[PDB]
UniProtKB/TrEMBL annotation, chains A, B:
UniProt name for this protein: ORF25
Protein encoded by which gene: ORF25
Bilayer-crossing regions: none
Annotated organism of origin: Human herpesvirus 8
Domain of life of the organism encoding this protein: Viruses
Length: 49, 49
């Protein structure tokens, strides 16, 4: 007998993802994560943990 | 005799234009001015004034 999740994981294009979605190619999974890098906290090196 | 402008008009990719700029091969003209039409005040009919 094992364990695990009991639901799925949502994916919504709310926010400024929608603005990139309509007039372009697409939007971004992890957009808040993506905005956290290049404007919010740049020049960080790729660390696993 | 005439009056007129005295300088140019700025165009910077500051803000979320840069976020689209690194990933996708485009950037808007005043992303906020484009943001207000689609997510802030949608379906406003286009009028000249």
């Amino acid at each position: 007998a094992m364990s695990g999740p009991a639901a799925y994981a949502s994916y919504v294009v709310r926010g400024a993802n929608l603005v990139t979605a309509v007039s372009y190619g697409r939007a971004m999974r992890n957009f808040e994560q993506f905005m956290a890098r290049i404007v919010d906290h740049p020049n960080a090196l790729p660390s696993v943990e």
